[PDB]
Amino acid sequence: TVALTVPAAALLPDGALGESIVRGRRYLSDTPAQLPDFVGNGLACRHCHPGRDGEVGTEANAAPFVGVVGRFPQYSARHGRLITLEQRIGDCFERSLNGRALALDHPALIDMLAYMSWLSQGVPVGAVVAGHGIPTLTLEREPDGVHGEALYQARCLACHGADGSGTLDADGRYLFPPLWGPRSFNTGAGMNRQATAAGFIKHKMPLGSLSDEEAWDVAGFVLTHPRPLF
Numbered sequence: 215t216v217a218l219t220v221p222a223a224a225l226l227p228d229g230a231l232g233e234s235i236v237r238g239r240r241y242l243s244d245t246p247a248q249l250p251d252f253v254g255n256g257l258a259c260r261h262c263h264p265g266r267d268g269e270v271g272t273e274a275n276a277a278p279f280v281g282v283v284g285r286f287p288q289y290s291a292r293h294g295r296l297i298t299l300e301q302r303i304g305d306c307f308e309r310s311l312n313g314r315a316l317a318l319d320h321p322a323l324i325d326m327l328a329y330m331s332w333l334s335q336g337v338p339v340g341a342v343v344a345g346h347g348i349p350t351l352t353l354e355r356e357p358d359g360v361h362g363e364a365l366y367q368a369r370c371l372a373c374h375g376a377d378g379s380g381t382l383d384a385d386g387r388y389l390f391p392p393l394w395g396p397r398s399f400n401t402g403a404g405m406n407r408q409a410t411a412a413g414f415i416k417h418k419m420p421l422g423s424l425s426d427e428e429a430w431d432v433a434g435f436v437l438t439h440p441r442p443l444f
């Protein structure tokens with residue numbers, strides 16, 4: 215692997231590319247408001263691909279976009295063939311955002327690509343960045359949703375809600391996003407898989423330490439709930 219670094223915003227180039235990168239960041243951080251025709255729920259890309267300092271997709275083990283562009287095209291078992299990054303983005307509009315894929319030459323899509331390419335600056339094509347993806351956590355027993363419910367009430371509810379519906383900010387964006395129900399990710403999302411949810415939770419939640427057993431069980435509880443069908 216090569217190490218994960220984030221380029222400096224102050225070194226963004228003047229011109230069409232620089233303007234595209236800035237728009238891309240906003241599409242990824244504020245997706246439902248910026249692309250209403252394509253987003254079917256309350257999630258922005260940043261809700262599973264967080265970043266520091268206003269950026270999106272810069273955190274190890276939370277599927278960073280740093281270095282993503284050099285890994286496509288690649289085989290997708292979902293598709294049964296090689297796909298491009300444009301297509302991959304569409305898949306998460308359809309699944310995690312319960313919406314519709316953008317046309318493959320849509321200017322918003324190209325702006326998102328430009329932002330991902332900027333984050334990937336300096337990464338050798340083909341190289342794998344340390345911390346890419348969301349490493350799974352898998353335990354050798356069933357997730358205990360009773361334990362999970364108790365953990366949820368004690369460790370998660372204050373942000374994500376008794377009903378899993380999250381907490382809105384003053385501008386109508388989710389400060390703390392919905393974990394289940396009609397505004398959350400659909401059943402086609404990667405986050406709907408036990409080992410992926412458990413892995414994400416293990417490394418990233420509660421925001422700002424859970425044991426493996428705790429992450430596994432609370433992921434189990436979260437995933438017992440209804441969400442939109444894909």
Ligand code: HEC
Pocket residue numbers: 257260261262263264366369370371372373374389390391392393398399405411414415418419420421424432433436
């Ligand atoms: C208690 C252990 C939990 C569990 C099971 C989850 N969270 Fe959170 N969460 C918070 C914020 C701001 C985000 C967005 C991403 C970020 O900026 O880091 C998240 C994201 C999640 C997700 C993915 C998104 C989704 O809607 O599904 C999941 C699965 C998730 N969380 C589970 C904020 C908070 C908190 C506020 C301080 C606390 C506490 C938690 N989360 C705790 C948990």
Ligand code: HEC
Pocket residue numbers: 242245257258259260261262263277278282285302303306307310311326346347348349399403404405410
């Ligand atoms: C949680 C509900 C998610 C939301 C909202 C979005 N994405 Fe996502 N994404 C998610 C997971 C669990 C994964 C798998 C990580 C792994 O281990 O590979 C992904 C993956 C991607 C990828 C591929 C990354 C790679 O390294 O190959 C891309 C390009 C991607 N996601 C883009 C993306 C965009 C543009 C989103 C807003 C439309 C978005 N995702 C939302 C979980 C979630």
Ligand SMILES: [S]
Pocket residue numbers: 305306307310
């Ligand atoms: S995604």
